[PDB]
Design an enzyme around this catalytic site. Sequence first.
Site, PDB file in Angstrom:
ATOM      1  N   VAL A 212      -6.457 -43.027  23.184  1.00  0.00           N
ATOM      2  CA  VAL A 212      -6.930 -43.065  21.806  1.00  0.00           C
ATOM      3  C   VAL A 212      -7.715 -44.353  21.594  1.00  0.00           C
ATOM      4  CG1 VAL A 212      -6.263 -43.148  19.382  1.00  0.00           C
ATOM      5  CG2 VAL A 212      -5.073 -41.617  20.949  1.00  0.00           C
TER       6      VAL A 212
ATOM      7  N   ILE B 225      -6.495 -48.200  21.544  1.00  0.00           N
ATOM      8  CA  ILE B 225      -5.308 -48.459  20.741  1.00  0.00           C
ATOM      9  C   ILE B 225      -4.137 -47.576  21.133  1.00  0.00           C
ATOM     10  CG2 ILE B 225      -6.691 -49.272  18.803  1.00  0.00           C
ATOM     11  CD1 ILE B 225      -6.182 -46.596  17.446  1.00  0.00           C
ATOM     12  N   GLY B 226      -4.305 -46.699  22.118  1.00  0.00           N
ATOM     13  CA  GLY B 226      -3.222 -45.837  22.543  1.00  0.00           C
ATOM     14  C   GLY B 226      -3.459 -45.169  23.881  1.00  0.00           C
ATOM     15  N   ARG B 227      -2.443 -45.189  24.741  1.00  0.00           N
ATOM     16  CA  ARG B 227      -2.463 -44.486  26.014  1.00  0.00           C
ATOM     17  C   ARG B 227      -1.245 -43.580  26.097  1.00  0.00           C
ATOM     18  NH1 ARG B 227      -3.507 -49.857  27.188  1.00  0.00           N
ATOM     19  NH2 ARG B 227      -5.581 -50.342  28.046  1.00  0.00           N
TER      20      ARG B 227
ATOM     21  N   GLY C   6       0.112 -39.257  27.551  1.00  0.00           N
ATOM     22  CA  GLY C   6      -0.199 -37.838  27.594  1.00  0.00           C
ATOM     23  C   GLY C   6      -1.354 -37.561  28.534  1.00  0.00           C
ATOM     24  N   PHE C   7      -2.293 -36.738  28.069  1.00  0.00           N
ATOM     25  CA  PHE C   7      -3.431 -36.311  28.872  1.00  0.00           C
ATOM     26  C   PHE C   7      -4.711 -37.048  28.493  1.00  0.00           C
ATOM     27  CE2 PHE C   7      -0.962 -32.114  28.522  1.00  0.00           C
ATOM     28  CZ  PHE C   7      -0.064 -32.528  29.486  1.00  0.00           C
ATOM     29  N   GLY C   8      -4.590 -38.272  27.985  1.00  0.00           N
ATOM     30  CA  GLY C   8      -5.756 -39.040  27.599  1.00  0.00           C
ATOM     31  C   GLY C   8      -5.429 -40.379  26.977  1.00  0.00           C
TER      32      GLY C   8
ATOM     33  N   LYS D 224      -8.842 -39.525  19.368  1.00  0.00           N
ATOM     34  CA  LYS D 224      -7.889 -39.122  20.400  1.00  0.00           C
ATOM     35  C   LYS D 224      -8.652 -38.291  21.421  1.00  0.00           C
ATOM     36  CE  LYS D 224      -3.294 -37.080  21.035  1.00  0.00           C
ATOM     37  NZ  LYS D 224      -2.073 -36.632  20.311  1.00  0.00           N
TER      38      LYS D 224
ATOM     39  N   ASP E  87       9.466 -32.892  17.529  1.00  0.00           N
ATOM     40  CA  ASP E  87       9.389 -34.025  18.449  1.00  0.00           C
ATOM     41  C   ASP E  87       9.387 -35.334  17.667  1.00  0.00           C
ATOM     42  OD1 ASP E  87       9.155 -35.681  20.617  1.00  0.00           O
ATOM     43  OD2 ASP E  87       7.360 -34.732  21.445  1.00  0.00           O
TER      44      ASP E  87
HETATM   45  F1  ZSO Z   1      -3.543 -38.862  24.249  1.00  0.00           F
HETATM   46  C1  ZSO Z   1      -2.561 -39.607  23.715  1.00  0.00           C
HETATM   47  C2  ZSO Z   1      -2.754 -40.968  23.519  1.00  0.00           C
HETATM   48  C3  ZSO Z   1      -1.738 -41.739  22.969  1.00  0.00           C
HETATM   49  C4  ZSO Z   1      -0.528 -41.150  22.619  1.00  0.00           C
HETATM   50  C5  ZSO Z   1       0.545 -41.984  22.031  1.00  0.00           C
HETATM   51  C6  ZSO Z   1       1.692 -42.179  23.016  1.00  0.00           C
HETATM   52  C7  ZSO Z   1       2.807 -42.992  22.366  1.00  0.00           C
HETATM   53  N1  ZSO Z   1       3.271 -42.305  21.146  1.00  0.00           N
HETATM   54  C8  ZSO Z   1       2.175 -42.192  20.165  1.00  0.00           C
HETATM   55  C9  ZSO Z   1       1.040 -41.356  20.737  1.00  0.00           C
HETATM   56  C10 ZSO Z   1      -0.092 -41.295  19.724  1.00  0.00           C
HETATM   57  O1  ZSO Z   1      -0.898 -42.460  19.901  1.00  0.00           O
HETATM   58  C11 ZSO Z   1      -1.711 -42.907  18.896  1.00  0.00           C
HETATM   59  C12 ZSO Z   1      -1.994 -44.266  18.798  1.00  0.00           C
HETATM   60  C13 ZSO Z   1      -2.816 -44.738  17.781  1.00  0.00           C
HETATM   61  C14 ZSO Z   1      -3.349 -43.835  16.871  1.00  0.00           C
HETATM   62  N2  ZSO Z   1      -4.155 -43.951  15.801  1.00  0.00           N
HETATM   63  N3  ZSO Z   1      -4.375 -42.673  15.235  1.00  0.00           N
HETATM   64  C15 ZSO Z   1      -3.711 -41.729  15.942  1.00  0.00           C
HETATM   65  C16 ZSO Z   1      -3.073 -42.489  16.969  1.00  0.00           C
HETATM   66  C17 ZSO Z   1      -2.252 -42.011  17.981  1.00  0.00           C
HETATM   67  C18 ZSO Z   1      -0.333 -39.788  22.817  1.00  0.00           C
HETATM   68  C19 ZSO Z   1      -1.350 -39.016  23.367  1.00  0.00           C
END
Ligand code: ZSO
Lengths: 617, 339, 63
Positions: free
Chosen positions: A172, A164-166, A168-170, A187, A284
């Site tokens: 989610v 559900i998320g990409r 940074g350094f990893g 995460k 931020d």
């Molecule tokens: F390791 C990561 C992965 C994704 C992100 C995204 C990059 C885009 N801005 C939002 C963040 C946070 O991403 C999420 C996305 C879904 C989530 N659900 N719970 C926490 C979450 C965090 C940051 C670092």
Amino acid sequence: KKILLPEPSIRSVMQKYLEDRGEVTFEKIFSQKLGYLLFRDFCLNHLEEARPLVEFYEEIKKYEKLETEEERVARSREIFDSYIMKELLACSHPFSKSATEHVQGHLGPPDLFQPYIEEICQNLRGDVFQKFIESDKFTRFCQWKNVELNIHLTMNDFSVHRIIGRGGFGEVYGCRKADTGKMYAMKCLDKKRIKMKQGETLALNERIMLSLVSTGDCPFIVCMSYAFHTPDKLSFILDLMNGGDLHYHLSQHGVFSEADMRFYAAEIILGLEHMHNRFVVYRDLKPANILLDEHGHVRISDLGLACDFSKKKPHASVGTHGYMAPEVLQKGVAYDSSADWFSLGCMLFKLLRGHSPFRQHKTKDKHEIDRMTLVELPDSFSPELRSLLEGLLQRDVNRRLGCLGRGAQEVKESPFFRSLDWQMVFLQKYPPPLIPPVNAADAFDTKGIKLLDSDQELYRNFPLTISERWQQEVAETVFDTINAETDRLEARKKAKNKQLDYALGKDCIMHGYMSKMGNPFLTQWQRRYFYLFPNRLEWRGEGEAPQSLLTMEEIQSVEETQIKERKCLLLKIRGGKQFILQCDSDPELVQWKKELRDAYREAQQLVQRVPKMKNKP
Amino acid sequence: SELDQLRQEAEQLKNQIRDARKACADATLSQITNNIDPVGRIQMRTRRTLRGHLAKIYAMHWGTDSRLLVSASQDGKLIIWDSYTTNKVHAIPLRSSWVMTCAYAPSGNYVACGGLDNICSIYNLKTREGNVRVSRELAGHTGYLSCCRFLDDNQIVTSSGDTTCALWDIETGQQTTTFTGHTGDVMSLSLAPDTRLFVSGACDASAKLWDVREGMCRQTFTGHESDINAICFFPNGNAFATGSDDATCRLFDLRADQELMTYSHDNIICGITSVSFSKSGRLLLAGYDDFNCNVWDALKADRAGVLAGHDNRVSCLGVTDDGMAVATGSWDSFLKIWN
Amino acid sequence: TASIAQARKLVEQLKMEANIDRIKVSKAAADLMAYCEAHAKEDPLLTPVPASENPFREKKFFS
Ligand SMILES: Fc1ccc([C@@H]2CCNC[C@H]2COc2ccc3n[nH]cc3c2)cc1
Ligand SMILES: [Mg+2]
């Protein structure tokens, strides 16, 4: 898979464990989610002395949560008449004279019974709390606390779903904790990608910041419930947000109207207030770091660049350019929450115009945006929106909105939010403007890297479990169902003994289950019930008296050891013999080590002054 | 100074006691008994081995029936054994793990024990429904209980590490009489057959003869160079033997008011833990710290027997009132009956 | 140590210990040797006893 409680005999070890930390006070057990649920069960169903005292507490809590005076007047009549007035009739009120005075005249707010709350605690802080400790409910509390203090999460404790998320350094993932079925967000950061970019401080800081904020159950911040790590990954267990970030929805939906942005601004303000009340600057704030849930409400996420100004203020230029305050972008300028309010004004401007306030005409270079350090607001903006943004984007901190002494309240009182009831904003009652329908949280985007022991010791204190978060998850899912299954099981163990205690009536210190080691080549671990006495350590088998024991005189040292990656106690005997004991949980290992160390040291020092018992040449 | 005078004539009275004693040493017991025949080689073999205790055995006591005996062990338990059948009559779990001594009432209806709990606990054996309940907890000592012996089912004499002995009334729990005098931890005591007197050994290397009814000390016997750990009366009540950490056993007569014989050997250096006489008093049995029980010719001071069967310190012994057998309790958690 | 009643109680006790009637060691020793001969006939540890009277040799029939 399912969570299993230890046997009731765990009480003997857990009670001494908690007493050595002062965690057996009324104040500390009553303020825990699981402890409260067990204390009220004892008071409501197992003690008519405390049954009216706790019903009065719960009716008050239900009254504090009431919304309108249309309901506070009607409920305050029943609570006062049924609980306070009925006892004055039979002249049996156990509250101070002045306590009723404050509530009596106050007739024709939610916090009218607060002087009574203190008086109810006094009536429970004492002999009523004593019978609860001696009751079977405190034993059940020790059964649950043993599970909480034995949490060692790995990837296997979760059912990982789609990404559900990409960024940074990893990345989610959505995930499901198997033992309770709670849906979370994992995460997962790769350590190799972290060491490659020297971002260890950033990753470590994020959990420290999450630890300061993940309490109180805030609905506008992505809070943390657990944090663990594998040899290669850093895992954060966070609140699930499967609706994508605003940076993505800003390009799909387009620019937002003033009223649609009033929704997002309201919820972010409350989120900023929660961090500022705990002395945390976000630093931020931008549409990328604001996620949507399944319904459309928003939360503040990714606390990597967040700082703590509790004792000493920060002063470095850290953040995303285009949103940093004048007291931040320059170097060597101290600041605090004042930075987030300027970041809010920059972010709110973007939701209306689709671009950063200073990224004019879609400039690409980073130094083209940080230049304008003093503000031309478009003509289509309403008069109230300008008064809000002008206060949020003032160059001076003395003339900045939200930096005049009262903090976030000054921003709530803006005429742009005249139409809002901030209680309904907190309760997430207002309809979100955008309901998400899936590749909705991407960001702006090598092997052969070393992972020495010096790197693994940077993440040494990374494992963490938020006690409030874990007890809430348990209380809403399996706490009621597991207590029932445990009760039916303990009743069968107790009823079977009739058709079938060695420690009572003597000077026994502590007793419980351990597993001594027989032949190690046979994986021979015998679970025996141990009894610790001031001079000996006995253990027994299945329905038989203790066959053998181990005197405190024989013990030379109690040491902690590892056997097949399992922590054990190592007792060295006077004859050069070794004695290995595996404990079923971390608190059992700690308490058995302290109590055995205390016992053999005391017993050896006592025998020394007894001619009949000491050793002579 | 009045205090300096009372110390001056105190040391001047002690020289009078020594002179009065030396005015009686016309002969030695060894000279008197030089004519009688030796006892030979007393050969005793292990008849019974009592198993049950889980740790060191600290004390024991025979019943007057010469069959039942009680024992106190480091495992916080009292066991009343049937010496003929090796079966356990009672397995009394104690309320304090620190037990040091135990006693068997002459009637065999009560037993006592105690130790670092500073309490003498009286247990009633024959109850209503065959239970073993604590009938009385004699509290009064400010030190550990070292020994105790029943007079009857209502009075008992105790010794403690507070340098005192005491006479107790069981029904009322009162400390009837106290026996002050010792300057060190009292270790053991022994009742005279007539029970008007008793002797007591302490860590001050002295033994004292007390009158039970008068509550006073009549005679003080010195001689040992170390702590006196054991003591036992001669059958005729006119003498008693002691055992000490000085690797010697010594015999004292009351009417001569001095030592008569010393039971030692350069071959032995470990201390004595327990002593007892045979039925006729001709034999003196002593338990030693070298895991052995030596049999001494009480009249000729020659070693006549050895009881080797324990792998740790022989902590207590005792002879049945009929003199049929000798029990030996040791730190190896075993009791052995010798005959 | 510095007590006067402690010194008095010590002196008066040493008087009770010094003003007793003592007998000759030879008299006290002969009385002991005479007792041992008087009861050497009744001491099972001093004289061997057959297995019948000895409840510990090879009996096993008890009450
Ligand atoms: F390791 C990561 C992965 C994704 C992100 C995204 C990059 C885009 N801005 C939002 C963040 C946070 O991403 C999420 C996305 C879904 C989530 N659900 N719970 C926490 C979450 C965090 C940051 C670092
Ligand atoms: Mg700065």
